[PDB]
């Protein structure tokens, strides 16, 4: 769906496309014959363009021509500009050269040598135009003053490849995890050559670490139980600027202020949120059931692994309901953005900072599991 629609989009060439599309804006200078031309034109394409440009809010009409140059450059292709084609040649030659001329002329206009009316010079000068245009010396000077004066190429305009295939750079972000996975593995092979070579504290010290990782798993559970701010909620209007710093339940806003704003609309999403609270509590409660049976192991360190086999059940059933609970909130938090969160939507929409932390609570629940079944082998 990406590469097709990327190749389905044609660059616009004619101005009839501008009467057809509305995503890329387009304008002329705020005063001149070119603006007057669309104001005067009776052709329905040019009339519709003028109908758009008189209704264009914000105003597409720029005050200087170089303002129309920069406004195309700053809008990044979604603003076009209409100007004289010979000047459009020359500005395309001038660096940064990030603009270009597309399509043919919209009309016919001609620069011509003018004399005062009735002057004697007027007739051989008029013959001189038909002499130099006949000999192409004008075109030689046009090659001079647009392409021998042109900074970006003379024929290098035709060096941009048209519709070629997928880039090697598309496959370069996977190279660093390709080679980086190899060099990380070479550390593992050389140390295990020394683990074959250097050789009740085995099963006990690893099981106490499984208790120790559950203690961290409890603390990051309580950490995202009140997030300091879930998202930097930005509504920075150039009105005025807005910086929501809303936690997981309390929606603080920030000079300092904090509110709750808990349990937004809708009701079917509310029953998901009521189900979200269930998966939060069953996460933490089955930790405590996992703590109590491992404290029986501490009494066994003062059944045994048979209850530790039962303790490994509920600690996995804890963290899986957390994997439910981590997906209950953020899907809902994605759903609330689809509601347009009533006045507190983020434009710096970015999960903050305890949600990365309670991620690590789950892997501490499972790294406790992979070593407490390592002690189950004995």
Ligand X SMILES: O=c1[nH]c2cc(C(F)(F)F)c(N3CCOCC3)cc2n(CP(=O)(O)O)c1=O
Q: Which residue is nearest to ligand AJP (CB)?
A: 119
Closest CA to 327 of 255, 259, 276: 276
x/- mask, ligand X, residues 47-66, rule CB under 6 A, reads: ------------------x-
Sequence-distant (6+) residues with CB within 8 A of 22 are 52
3-state secondary structure of 120: coil
Contact between 285 and a second copy per CB under 8 A: no
Among 133, 202, 222, 348, binds another protein (CB under 8 A): 133
Query: Facing residues of 243 across strands?
Result: 234
Among 120, 159, 167, 169, binds a second copy (CB under 8 A): 169
Contact between 258 and a second copy per CB under 8 A: no
Tell me which stretch binds another protein (CB under 8 A): 73-81, 214-222, 254-262, 359-367. Answer: 73-81
Residue 348 φ/ψ, nearest 5 degrees: -105, 40
Contact between 168 and a second copy per CB under 8 A: yes
Alpha helices in 224-353 (DSSP H): 267-300, 305-339
Q: Choose from ligand X, another protein, ligand AJP, none: what does 65 bind? Cβ within 5-8 Å by kind.
A: ligand X
Least Å distance between CB 248 and another protein?
34
Annotated ligand binding at 84? The verdict is yes
x/- mask, a second copy, residues 172-191, rule CB under 8 A, reads: x--x---x--x---x-----
8 Å CB contact between 206 and 371:
yes
Tell me which stretch binds ligand X (CB under 6 A): 19-27, 31-39, 325-333, 351-359. Answer: 31-39
Distance CA 34, CA 41 (A): 10
Distance CA 94, CA 80 (A): 18
Contact between 40 and ligand X per CB under 6 A: no
Query: Facing residues of 10 across strands?
Result: none
Q: Is the Cβ of residue 63 or residue 204 nearer to ligand X in the bound state? A: 63
Sequence positions preceding breaks in the chain, C–N over 2.5 Å = 199, 238, 254, 302
Closest CA to 43 of 122, 106, 125: 106
Contact between 25 and another protein per CB under 8 A: no
Distance CA 378, CA 369 (A): 15
Contact between 330 and ligand X per CB under 6 A: no
3-state secondary structure of 345: coil
**226: which DSSP letter?**
G
Least Å distance between CB 170 and a second copy?
11
Dmax over CA atoms of the chain, in Å, equals: 122
Return left, alpha or beta for 97; rule: phi > 0 is left, psi -120 to 50 is alpha, else beta.
left
Annotated ligand binding at 89? The verdict is no
Q: Is the Cβ of residue 85 or residue 331 nearer to ligand X in the bound state? A: 85
- Locate 160 and state its tokens: 């941009």
Tell me which stretch binds ligand AJP (CB under 6 A): 47-55, 62-70, 118-126, 229-237. Answer: 118-126
Q: Give the interface size with a second copy as a residue count (CB under 8 A).
A: 15
**What's the angle, vertex CA 71, arms to CA 59 and CA 9, rounded to 5?**
95
Annotated ligand binding at 151? The verdict is no
Query: Residues 10 to 29: which contact ligand X by CB under 6 A?
Result: 29
Contact residues for a second copy, defined by CB under 8 A:
168-169, 172, 175, 179, 182, 186, 313, 317, 320, 323-324, 327, 331, 334
Positions at the binding site for L-glutamate = 33-34, 84
Positions at the binding site = 33-34, 84
């Amino acid at each position: 769906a990406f590469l097709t629609v990327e190749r389905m989009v044609s660059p616009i060439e004619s101005a009839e496309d501008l009467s057809k599309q509305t995503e890329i804006a387009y304008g002329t200078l705020d005063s001149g014959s070119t603006k007057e031309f669309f104001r005067r034109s009776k052709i329905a394409v040019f009339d519709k363009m003028w109908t758009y440009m008189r209704s264009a809010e914000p105003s597409v009409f720029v005050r200087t021509t170089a303002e129309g140059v920069a406004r195309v450059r700053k809008s990044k292709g979604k603003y076009a500009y209409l100007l004289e084609s010979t000047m459009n040649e020359y500005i395309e030659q001038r660096k940064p050269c990030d603009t270009m001329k597309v399509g043919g002329n919209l009309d016919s206009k001609g620069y011509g040598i003018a004399t005062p009316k009735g002057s004697s010079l007027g007739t051989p000068v008029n013959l001189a135009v038909l002499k130099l245009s006949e000999q192409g010396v004008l075109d030689k000077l046009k090659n001079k003053w647009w392409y021998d004066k042109g900074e970006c190429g003379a024929k290098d305009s035709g060096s941009k490849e048209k519709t070629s295939a997928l880039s090697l750079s598309n496959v370069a972000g996977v190279f660093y995890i390709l080679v980086g996975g190899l060099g990380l593995a070479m550390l593992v092979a050389l140390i295990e050559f020394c683990y074959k070579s250097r050789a009740k504290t085995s099963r006990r010290g690893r099981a106490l670490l499984a208790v120790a990782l559950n203690l961290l798993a409890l603390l990051f559970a309580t950490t995202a139980f009140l997030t300091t701010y879930w998202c930097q909620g930005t509504q920075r209007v150039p009105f005025q600027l807005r910086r929501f710093h809303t936690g997981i339940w309390y929606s603080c806003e920030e000079g300092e202020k904090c509110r709750s704003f808990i349990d937004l609309a809708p009701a079917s999403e509310k029953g998901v949120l009521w189900l979200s609270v269930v998966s939060e509590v069953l996460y933490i409660l089955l930790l405590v059931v996992g703590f109590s049976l491992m404290c029986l192991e501490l009494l066994h360190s003062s059944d045994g692994l048979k209850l530790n086999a039962f303790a490994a059940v509920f600690t996995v059933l804890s963290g899986l309901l957390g994997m439910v609970a981590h997906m209950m909130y953020t899907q809902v938090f994605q759903v609330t953005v689809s509601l347009g969160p009533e006045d507190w939507r983020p434009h710096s929409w970015d999960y903050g900072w305890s949600f990365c932390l309670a991620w690590g609570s789950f892997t501490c629940c499972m790294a406790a599991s992979v070593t407490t079944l390592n002690s189950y082998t004995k």
